[PDB]
Amino acid sequence: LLGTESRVPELQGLVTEHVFLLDKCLRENSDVKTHGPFEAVMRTLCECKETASKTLSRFGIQPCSICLGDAKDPVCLPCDHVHCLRCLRAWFSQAHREAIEKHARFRQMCNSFFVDLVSTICFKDNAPPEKEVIESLLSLLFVQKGRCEHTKSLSPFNDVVDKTPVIRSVILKLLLKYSFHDVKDYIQEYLTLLKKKAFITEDKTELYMLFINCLEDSILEKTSAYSRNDELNHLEEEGRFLKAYSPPANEASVEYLQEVARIR
């Protein structure tokens, strides 16, 4: 709202309505860490969007199905469409580009809100969220677009996707706010989904380094708050682990990566 109040004021109105509706969708079960309210917020957001879209557009602001992404610098055809000239030229007036900019702005800010919520209200406890919430959040990193899966930043929307897969680490940094013992299953599921035919092909050393850096950071985060005696207890426990530690072809489970980060 405040952002849109400066860059695209024409949509303030709509927004200030949905705000209350948000207040109204979380009025009985505000445990957004659950399935019901989480899906409710996602729907409310897609509707605030999708209607900023229906109102900003003359007929439709759908991204370019051939660029497989946002139709930036598009040209408005007489074919009830807007497309980048290059693509459907190979296939063979700033109202629309200002509108595309405005919609991109609205979408960016809605995604900012979604991630800030998921990080501050959905991941904020000494306990984790439920299973369905994590599964939905993970599935939000993948899209079977019309033509082929694709990776997108954490967002309920399906219009902004990463053409060349980019395996970011945002859900992991959150899941690791808690003890690895609980979230290990979800991390392994994410690693399987990624290592799957979906995006990664071979020599997954970088994805493993990614998980490893994430776990190392989580552990440093948990140990930074340790006091003196807590620090010496951590030292003694690490010594015990090293004393008791000892040893899946061409495949690294998350437990192996955690042991790696720990010994590192």
Binding site: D203, K204, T205, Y208, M209, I212, N213, E216, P248, A249, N250, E251, A252, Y256, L257, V260, R264
Partner: protein, 75 residues
Amino acid sequence: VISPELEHLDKTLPTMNNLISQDKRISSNPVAKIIYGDPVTFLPHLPRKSVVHCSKIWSCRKRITVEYLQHIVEQ
């Protein structure tokens, strides 16, 4: 006059490190190969049964501090 070099470090330092590793003075030094090259080329005991057992996994990882964050903020 200085800042451009500070900006181009990320590409000028690897060249210097390669030249240092290749100089005959320490080219055959095992510690030099370790610090700069992959020790699998001269250490046979290195287990090579996994993807975790790679030098890149066991490469040094710069620690994050407030000063690095300040440098990033400035850049």
